Design a protein around this ligand. Sequence first.
Ligand SMILES: NC(=[NH2+])NCCC[C@H](N)C(=O)N[C@@H](Cc1ccc(O)cc1)C(=O)O
Ligand SMILES: NC(=[NH2+])NCCC[C@H](N)C(=O)N[C@@H](Cc1ccc(O)cc1)C(=O)O
Ligand SMILES: [Mg+2]
Ligand SMILES: [Mg+2]
Lengths: 354, 353
Amino acid sequence: MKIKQVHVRASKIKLKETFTIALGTIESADSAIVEIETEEGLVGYGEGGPGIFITGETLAGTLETIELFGQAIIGLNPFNIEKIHEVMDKISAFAPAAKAAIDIACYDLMGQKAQLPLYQLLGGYDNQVITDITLGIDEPNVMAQKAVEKVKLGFDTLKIKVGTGIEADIARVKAIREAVGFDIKLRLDANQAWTPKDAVKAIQALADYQIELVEQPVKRRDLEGLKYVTSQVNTTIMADESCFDAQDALELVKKGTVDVINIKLMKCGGIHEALKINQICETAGIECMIGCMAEETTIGITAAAHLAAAQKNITRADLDATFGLETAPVTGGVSLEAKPLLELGEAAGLGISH
Amino acid sequence: MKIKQVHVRASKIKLKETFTIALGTIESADSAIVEIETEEGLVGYGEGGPGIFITGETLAGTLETIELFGQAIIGLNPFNIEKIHEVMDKISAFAPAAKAAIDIACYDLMGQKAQLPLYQLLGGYDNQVITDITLGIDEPNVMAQKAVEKVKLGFDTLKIKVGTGIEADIARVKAIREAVGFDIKLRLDANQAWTPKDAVKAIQALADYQIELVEQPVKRRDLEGLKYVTSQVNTTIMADESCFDAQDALELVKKGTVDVINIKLMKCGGIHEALKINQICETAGIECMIGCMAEETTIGITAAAHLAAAQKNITRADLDATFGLETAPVTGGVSLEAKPLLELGEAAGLGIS
Ligand SMILES: NC(=[NH2+])NCCC[C@H](N)C(=O)N[C@@H](Cc1ccc(O)cc1)C(=O)O
Ligand SMILES: NC(=[NH2+])NCCC[C@H](N)C(=O)N[C@@H](Cc1ccc(O)cc1)C(=O)O
Ligand SMILES: [Mg+2]
Ligand SMILES: [Mg+2]
């Protein structure tokens, strides 16, 4: 198998609602979609979802970088994922969105060539995954109200954003908890909004509210502070923005900074790197959750789902990007229907087309 | 795809010459060969080559463990390597040769089902690997003579076994270098024979002999002593017995114990675990060398070679076990011919039988 050409396009999908977190707001899912054509005719799909306030990556920069990658890998075999990453890494010192777009299309091609759904090439642990659904920052009563709706859809786990103030945030969670029950799992995400000591105070305050875990409570670069929190509360602390790639993961398990690590293909540059992170974490006894950017769609979510279902240590999933899309940019893959169960079929690769 | 049956049998193959290392001698390559058959008819080949003075595993124990593993994975998909290792790990707390045997057969099946050479499923970086050849412990003049012989076979890298005493060990290396010149790369392996200070002393004494690297100079459990050697000499230090699995590797990287790590499928329980070790090392800027047990045959060596060719970070290889074998247990795969280049064909999976 040999890459004949790489085509990249912009993709802009209107979001059903404006999503808000501690870092900013978004109202449209704008990403870069890649199609890698082989000499034999097979075409793999990939996506790069840039999050300016998460990674600093932009759609313009991502499109440019992908174009450089595409010309550099013509003639290579999609199965030589080792060299493909070598090539991209030599070209750019940092561009996980661009690299993920190329990486994902390559794994899609691998599945299609082997004639196997992707999850079978990535571990084969399972052929489906259960995802939570996130609730963007809003008024305590507003969020609590939306919870009942999602639960009604079948969701047993809700991801709750907070970060305006320990005061209002605590009010947020409480409102939601005593609103949907106690059989519903509740994970919180403060997107670096709290200081070390305020984080501890805020977390402990929800002791009787039964919180599954708290995601990135402090600034991504404040590793001593993040470890402070983790070591001050019994509640499970998860690192997100503090962990982009495998080298970050190694540093975290090294220092014993957190309990769980959130993996995003758009932060690490694709499945090849995500596998490394998960392997490092599993070896250290740290479970992983697979997440997503608000700007990615069907292709990125589908890729992440195959990986999550395939790897045992990826024990949690936050793949709800497609639930907010007004329309699907492609055919097949994870549907836009807001449901917790993402079942991967037997279609080869990502099972995506059109 | 589903596993229908698991067959396992004993293979006892004489070595053409007794192989001596610091830990003892080996006279026969006795391994367990497994054949995993799927309901559709595809059959995967695997092997468990236990090295008693390395892991403590025996052929009898490896056979009993494989049998336990075999009857527990009936009906599972070979592609579900994640669950297959979970099942084996729950059954046994320690049996890397047995686990490798099942693991390798599964990857062979994956390759066959996908209709792809195994190296394509494991990274696809290359389709061949260049191996060194090891010289067993002997008198300086003899080892030197044997060195010239191997170089004549085209080998550009020789792995020198040492460990009977810094006095002799230093004499062995000096003699070898004098015989083959500085064009040949020489890596040493002490198999835990030296104290940390004798190690530094021996290494410093060979500074002018252009030593590529020194493998496991001190006892396996003496990590502080191993790091001591590593931080006392400019020569590259490699861990072998100090690193069995991914957890060991993570510990070595955390402590900055060594510069390179030796991966053996028979130490870590198969390709699945070997990949973890290499990824951990790569992430930490530690290169890896793929090695082998004397007891392995074409099956084990072929699997190791596919993995080494596939992964960029596995930059060195010591896959010379088939060179000492009187016979080959299966057709295909790496041949018995003593040659540095191991070219993997385009046959699906291992390309065996
Ligand atoms: N329906 C809906 N609004 N889904 C958004 C999914 C976002 C995802 N669960 C998430 O929280 N991702 C990041 C935060 C984030 C927000 C916005 C953008 O553009 C990028 C990332 C996280 O987990 O922190
Ligand atoms: N002549 C011969 N049969 N050589 C086999 C060399 C195997 C390999 N290169 C090696 O050295 N492996 C171990 C040492 C070892 C010796 C004997 C047994 O049974 C198992 C392992 C090492 O690298 O230390
Ligand atoms: Mg987060
Ligand atoms: Mg060794």
